[PDB]
């Protein structure tokens, strides 16, 4: 086990297949497509290769009544590594359409089969958000005491894709589109600024109704959780001050340099003016010579 | 009424358009939007000889709209033309507001009334001659920090305590000496900041500078394909 892993990576496939996957087993919602997820680990980068299916059935009237194919997992695993020794156990998917807390009872299965720490992947399968529906979750084992001795819990990671020349270049061809998650150009950066805002604006509502639920809904006081709160207000910026002055006098040099800038731009395309009058200039002696070829070709004409 | 169009409209027209807004906003009083005009009046016209006539007429105007806003004009300008014989009378007037010189600017415009009076210049001259005072104790004020209302009297030869207070008082509600007086203390004291790095100013400037190069670059993109179309038309290799 190690819990060094900062990124995971996931490849466009791993993705694709177990969303795939969900409507292969033809399952709907409360019945699970769990598969396992082969790829590298033991390193910062997790690099996910691949992934297949498992039957997975859930029973929800107990959540220690489970159905897990085990002899399927052993026998699948050796035959993918004659293809390709890269792949190992890295861990399981999970369907969705949400988080549990029944999780961690299946996550136990997992933890005996690999010598990472398994990566749980709740794969949203319905797709909100104008971000990637993939969350990581990778579980970390540490003493905490929030009314517990030992805490296991899972920690999220960054999801993020990676991808071969291959892999990329048959996405780029299913898609008809020219991407505006790439913060390239000007016009995409442009795109992106308003998606920032909307973003914030609805995480905030989730944190507020979480709050008004504890003092009217009464869920318990949670001094953990609140007290990380407590420190976003602490380190707020506060203006009317130097500080805030410091950003006048930014402003201006940032400004008057567009404007220099736009002073080159400016000379650029005037001078490009001049050129195509040039063309124009020239345009009319060549037909100037063809204006004299065609007099003669209408001598011709009345002749013949 | 507005229906002043731009859509086919000659450059002689609009040249002359311009001449007119020019004087119409000067008399009754708003100097701000008559300097853009002013200026865009020389750039329509051409620069010709048989046109230096219209040249000259607009030339003796731009010394008074840009003065009473409260910007002196080029002593280059009319320095370096030809026109400078024409516009000698109107020299004299622009070193009078440099100066601060009462005095000054009154001898001018008494030798000179005449030639004034055909140009219409001289009901505009009346009204500069607020110009020439505020510029006196402009200077006074740019120099001396402290100095007691008792010197600035001597200096501008102005008739009592009580005249010296109230050219200065009128000067700070619109700003331009910006100082404070102080009765009590015997002194005038200057308040000035005279910094404009650290407001907010600068944006405001760039603003203008960035709009009017983007619009010369669709200017360029417009203008540029209409003769290609043409040559296209007929008939070349």
Redesign the interface.
């Known amino acids: 086990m190690s819990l060094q892993h900062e990124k995971v990576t996931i490849a466009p496939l791993v993705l694709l297949s177990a969303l795939d996957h969900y409507e292969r087993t033809q399952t709907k919602e409360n019945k699970r497509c769990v598969g396992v997820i082969l790829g590298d680990a033991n390193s910062s980068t997790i690099r996910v290769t691949n992934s297949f299916a498992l039957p997975f059935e859930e029973d929800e009237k107990n959540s220690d009544v489970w159905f897990l194919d085990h002899n399927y997992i052993e026998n699948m695993n050796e035959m993918c590594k004659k293809i390709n020794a890269k792949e190992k156990l890295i861990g399981w998917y999970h369907s969705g359409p949400k988080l549990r807390a029944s999780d961690l009872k299946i996550n136990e299965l997992f933890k005996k089969y690999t010598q990472n720490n398994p990566l749980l992947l709740i794969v949203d399968v319905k797709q909100q958000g104008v971000g990637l529906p993939t969350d990581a979750y990778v579980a970390i084992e540490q003493v905490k005491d929030d009314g517990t001795s030992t805490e296991k819990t899972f920690l999220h990671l960054p999801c993020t894709i990676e991808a071969e020349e291959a892999e990329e270049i048959g996405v780029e061809h299913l898609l008809r589109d020219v991407r505006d998650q790439a913060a390239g150009g000007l016009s995409i950066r442009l795109t992106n600024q308003l998606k920032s805002l909307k973003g914030l604006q609805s995480k905030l509502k989730d944190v507020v109704e979480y709050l008004d639920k504890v003092i009217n809904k009464e869920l318990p006081i949670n001094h953990t959780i609140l007290g990380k709160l407590q420190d976003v207000f602490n380190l707020l910026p506060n203006l009317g001050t130097p500080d805030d002055?410091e950003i006048?006098?930014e402003?201006?040099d940032r400004?008057?340099i567009?404007?220099n800038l736009?002073?080159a731009?400016?000379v650029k395309?005037?001078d490009?003016?001049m050129v195509?009058?040039i063309?124009?200039l020239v345009?009319?002696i060549?037909?100037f010579?063809?204006?004299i070829e065609?007099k003669i070709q209408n001598k011709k004409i009345q002749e013949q | 009424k507005l229906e002043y169009p731009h859509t086919d409209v000659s450059s002689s027209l609009e040249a002359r358009y311009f001449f007119y807004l020019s004087k119409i906003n000067a008399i009754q009083l708003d100097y701000s939007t008559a300097n853009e005009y002013i200026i865009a009046a020389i750039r329509k016209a051409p620069h010709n000889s048989k046109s230096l006539g219209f040249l000259q007429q607009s030339n003796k105007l731009h010394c008074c709209i840009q003065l009473l806003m409260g910007d002196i004009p080029e002593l280059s300008f009319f320095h370096q033309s030809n026109m400078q014989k024409s516009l000698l009378p109107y020299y004299h007037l622009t070193k009078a507001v440099k100066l601060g010189d009462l005095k000054k600017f009154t001898s001018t415009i008494t030798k000179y009334k005449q030639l004034l009076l055909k140009d219409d210049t001289y009901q505009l001259c009346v009204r500069l001659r607020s110009n020439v005072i505020k510029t006196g104790i402009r200077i006074i004020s740019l120099t001396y920090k402290k100095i007691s209302l008792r010197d600035i009297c001597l200096k501008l030869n102005l008739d009592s305590e009580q005249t010296v207070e109230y050219m200065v008082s009128r000067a700070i509600r619109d700003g331009v000496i910006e100082a404070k007086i102080n009765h009590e203390d015997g002194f005038i004291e200057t308040t000035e900041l005279l910094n404009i790095?650290?407001?907010?100013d600068?944006?405001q400037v760039?603003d203008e500078?960035?709009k009017f190069?983007?619009q010369?670059?669709d200017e360029?993109?417009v203008?540029?394909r209409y003769?290609?179309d043409k040559?296209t038309q007929?008939?070349?290799?």
């Open positions: 002055d006048d006098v402003n201006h400004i008057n567009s404007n736009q002073k731009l400016t395309t005037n490009e003016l195509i009058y063309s124009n345009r009319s060549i037909a010579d063809d204006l065609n | 790095y650290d407001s907010e600068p944006q760039f500078r960035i190069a983007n010369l670059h360029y993109l203008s540029m003769p290609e040559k007929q008939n070349e290799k």
